[PDB]
Amino acid sequence: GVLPGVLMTREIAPLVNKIYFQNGANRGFREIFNRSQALNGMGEMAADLVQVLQKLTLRDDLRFLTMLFWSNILTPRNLFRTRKAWCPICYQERHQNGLVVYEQLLWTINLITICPQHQKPLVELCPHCNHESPLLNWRSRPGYCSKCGEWLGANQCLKTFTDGEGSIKLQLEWQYWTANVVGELILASQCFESAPSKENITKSLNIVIDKVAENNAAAFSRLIGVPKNSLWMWQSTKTLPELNTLLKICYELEIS
Amino acid sequence: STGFPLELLTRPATERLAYFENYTVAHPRLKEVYEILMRTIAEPAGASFIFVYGASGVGKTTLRLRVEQKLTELALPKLESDRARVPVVGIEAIAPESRYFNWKEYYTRALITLEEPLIDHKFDYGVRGISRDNFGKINVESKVVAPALRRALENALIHRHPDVFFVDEAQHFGKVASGYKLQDQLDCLKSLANMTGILHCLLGTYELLTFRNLSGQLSRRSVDIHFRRYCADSPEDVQAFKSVLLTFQQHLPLAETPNLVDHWEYFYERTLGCIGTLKDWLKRVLSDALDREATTITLKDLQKRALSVAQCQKMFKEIQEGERQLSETEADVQNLRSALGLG
Amino acid sequence: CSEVREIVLSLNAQGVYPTEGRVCELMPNPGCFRYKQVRAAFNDARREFGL
DNA sequence: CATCAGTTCGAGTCTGGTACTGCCCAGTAGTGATCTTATTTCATTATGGTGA
Numbered sequence: 131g132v133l134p135g136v137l138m139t140r141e142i143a144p145l146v147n148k149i150y151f152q153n154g155a156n157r158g159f160r161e162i163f164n165r166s167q168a169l170n171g172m173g174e175m176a177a178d179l180v181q182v183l184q185k186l187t188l189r190d191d192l193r194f195l196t197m198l199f200w201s202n203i204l205t206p207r208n209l210f211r212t213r214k215a216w217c218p219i220c221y222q223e224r225h226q227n228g229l230v231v232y233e234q235l236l237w238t239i240n241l242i243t244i245c246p247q248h249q250k251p252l253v254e255l256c257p258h259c260n261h262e263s264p265l266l267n268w269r270s271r272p273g274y275c276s277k278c279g280e281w282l283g284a285n286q287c288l289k290t291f292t293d294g295e296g297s298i299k300l301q302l303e304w305q306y307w308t309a310n311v312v313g314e315l316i317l318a319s320q321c322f323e324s325a326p327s328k329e330n331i332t333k334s335l336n337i338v339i340d341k342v343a344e345n346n347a348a349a350f351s352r353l354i355g356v357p358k359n360s361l362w363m364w365q366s367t368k369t370l371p372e373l374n375t376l377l378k379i380c381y382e383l384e385i386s
Numbered sequence: 387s388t389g390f391p392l393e394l395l396t397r398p399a400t401e402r403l404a405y406f407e408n409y410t411v412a413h414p415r416l417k418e419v420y421e422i423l424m425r426t427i428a429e430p431a432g433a434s435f436i437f438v439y440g441a442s443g444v445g446k447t448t449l450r451l452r453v454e455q456k457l458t459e460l461a462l463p464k465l466e467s468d469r470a471r472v473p474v475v476g477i478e479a480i481a482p483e484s485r486y487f488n489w490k491e492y493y494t495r496a497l498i499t500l501e502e503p504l505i506d507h508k509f510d511y512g513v514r515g516i517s518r519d520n521f522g523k524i525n526v527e528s529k530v531v532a533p534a535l536r537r538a539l540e541n542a543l544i545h546r547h548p549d550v551f552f553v554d555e556a557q558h559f560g561k562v563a564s565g566y567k568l569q570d571q572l573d574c575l576k577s578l579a580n581m582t583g584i585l586h587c588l589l590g591t592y593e594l595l596t597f598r599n600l601s602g603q604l605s606r607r608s609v610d611i612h613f614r615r616y617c618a619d620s621p622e623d624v625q626a627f628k629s630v631l632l633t634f635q636q637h638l639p640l641a642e643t644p645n646l647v648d649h650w651e652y653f654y655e656r657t658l659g660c661i662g663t664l665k666d667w668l669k670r671v672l673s674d675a676l677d678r679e680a681t682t683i684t685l686k687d688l689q690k691r692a693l694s695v696a697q698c699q700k701m702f703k704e705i706q707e708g709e710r711q712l713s714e715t716e717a718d719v720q721n722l723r724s725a726l727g728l729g
Numbered sequence: 730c731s732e733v734r735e736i737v738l739s740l741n742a743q744g745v746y747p748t749e750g751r752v753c754e755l756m757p758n759p760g761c762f763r764y765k766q767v768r769a770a771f772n773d774a775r776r777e778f779g780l
Numbered sequence: 781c782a783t784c785a786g787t788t789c790g791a792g793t794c795t796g797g798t799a800c801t802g803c804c805c806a807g808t809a810g811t812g813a814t815c816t817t818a819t820t821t822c823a824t825t826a827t828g829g830t831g832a
């Protein structure tokens with residue numbers, strides 16, 4: 131029954147030893163709100179938030195809540211949305227079925243665009259008031275705007291696709307493929323014992339280049355369109371390809 | 387077999403109870419009162435008030451429930467093009483476990499029971515306190531004064547135009563605390579019916595006859611129905627009562643049909659023609675017997691849960707007073723002609 | 730903080746009760762009192778003159 | 781030989797991780813005023829039977 135900003139300021143921030151946590155817990159903790167994306171990241175701030183929530187609640191599986199399991203296989207370069215992403219149809223479905231409205235991790239990914247369960251692109255702006263809201267504000271609430279505070283769901287949303295049969299179907303199929311790939315990734319998180327390493331990408335690239343590219347990179351780079359410098363960086367150094375690039379390569383191989 | 391199917395015996399006693407408690411019967415009195423009530427509802431003809439007198443525990447609510455379900459399943463085909471029109475509204479709305487009947491509580495309850503059926507988002511009540519919410523419910527405060535609530539309810543009833551405004555246990559409308567007159571309360575309710583144009587069918591027990599005729603305006607606008615009981619003097623009514631008892635026996639969920647017909651007159655001393663009261667007594671007796679796993683109902687079980695003679699004679703006196711107040715005879719007609727001047 | 734001090738001084742000199750709202754109403758940026766010292770200075774001046 | 785593929789150097793661009801500034805509103809508790817209402821008194825008013 132308290133505002134999430136109040137809970138962060140008066141219950142979490144003093145429990146965090148960082149200087150800026152304690153200082154901003156008394157003048158408006160806008161640092162943690164303007165960068166609510168990084169709370170779900172792979173890095174140290176996300177891990178600290180999980181640790182403090184574990185201390186406050188005494189759980190045992192809050193690491194699966196985020197994709198921190200994959201801090202060695204992903205990269206926060208153009209990965210997380212600055213503004214909220216929600217499926218209104220899922221919001222009503224869960225509200226009308228009597229279940230709890232829960233914000234999904236999959237929505238925070240910039241690559242994800244549509245809801246796999248209700249076949250509609252997510253909304254990135256409040257329909258009632260044309261104002262943007264971050265992933266966690268001072269008055270955030272499941273199913274409500276951070277500024278207007280009214281229900282954002284609908285049985286039928288106000289956004290529809292354009293009329294076109296040339297490339298819209300291909301884009302929708304690509305979006306479905308990406309959403310299913312990320313969903314299977316998250317689902318297999320729990321079953322997997324430990325995350326694959328960067329060396330796993332190294333040997334995977336060594337395999338694929340030596341499978342159909344007969345040990346050449348120019349053909350592969352032209353096939354996927356990425357400049358060969360990035361191909362060398364992926365195949366030789368400890369550089370993790372972007373998720374968009376990763377699953378574009380996967381689509382070129384047509385393998386999850 | 388016109389009775390209950392023989393496959394309800396292997397099921398546990400809970401299933402037999404769940405089959406019997408929602409099972410209703412059609413006695414001729416119920417059929418005739420339902421017919422007349424449906425007719426006067428369908429054509430009100432400028433009648434602001436309908437009064438439905440009757441005994442307690444006779445089925446006057448089984449009747450209201452049937453009226454609501456029929457009005458719904460009639461208006462449901464008409465709800466595909468007509469918007470914000472509730473087929474039927476039936477409540478109690480008079481002193482819900484309250485010491486004195488309150489007009490503000492009645493208005494707010496009428497509003498919340500008039501709007502909750504439909505999830506509507508375009509209604510603008512003529513008020514600043516009561517409004518809707520994004521979820522579609524009706525939001526009310528404890529600040530709005532009674533005139534504002536009256537305005538809101540009048541606007542809602544005009545926009546929604548329900549067929550009826552069934553109120554139950556209306557005999558407690560007379561709980562006016564102190565310093566008030568009953569004619570003022572009828573004037574307020576008939577006014578609500580006037581500016582709104584709705585039909586208020588006030589049902590309940592014989593106390594209602596308290597209002598029968600207070601003013602001339604009330605007299606001309608009132609349509610009265612008397613859900614009369616079963617009286618042993620009439621032979622065909624005794625035939626109908628025993629037939630109702632047989633019908634109970636044939637649909638009674640037991641391995642074999644027990645012999646309760648022979649005690650018909652005895653049943654009268656425990657029933658007084660109150661078919662509802664007889665149904666509750668039989669249901670309690672059968673529940674008690676089936677708790678001990680008895681396949682038949684005997685006279686001993688009937689005497690175990692039988693009603694008390696003092697209570698029966700008390701309600702008999704009340705019913706006799708009500709009937710002698712309601713009684714109409716040729717002497718009254720002749721007095722009417724004598725007063726009028728028609729020779 | 731000084732400006733608040735002369736404002737309360739002059740307001741009491743004329744005769745009106747110097748409150749936070751009245752002092753704010755005659756100072757160009759009446760939102761500086763969120764600073765944890767300006768309000769302290771105003772309260773200290775009020776206590777010094779006896780409120 | 782001159783074309784194309786495997787390697788380098790350094791700049792472009794995002795983003796997390798860390799700290800900080802300039803500013804008035806909103807809620808609550810005092811009083812004094814003015815209605816407002818479920819509930820407690822001040823008269824008349826009708827009913828009663830019998831000894832002068």
Ligand SMILES: Nc1ncnc2c1ncn2[C@@H]1O[C@H](COP(=O)(O)OP(=O)(O)OP(=O)(O)O)[C@@H](O)[C@H]1O
Pocket residue numbers: 407409410411412413416441442443444445446447448554555589590591661662663665666
């Ligand atoms: N014809 C009937 N068939 C089956 N059950 C009946 C019948 N009539 C009444 N009942 C039973 O009567 C019970 C409710 O009481 P009932 O409706 O008879 O009283 P009511 O006189 O209408 O009430 P109230 O005096 O409060 O208005 C229910 O258990 C219902 O099953």
Ligand SMILES: [Mg+2]
Pocket residue numbers: 443445446447
């Ligand atoms: Mg009833």
Ligand SMILES: [Zn+2]
Pocket residue numbers: 217218219220221245246247248249
């Ligand atoms: Zn959805």
Ligand SMILES: [Zn+2]
Pocket residue numbers: 256257258259275276277278279280
């Ligand atoms: Zn909003």
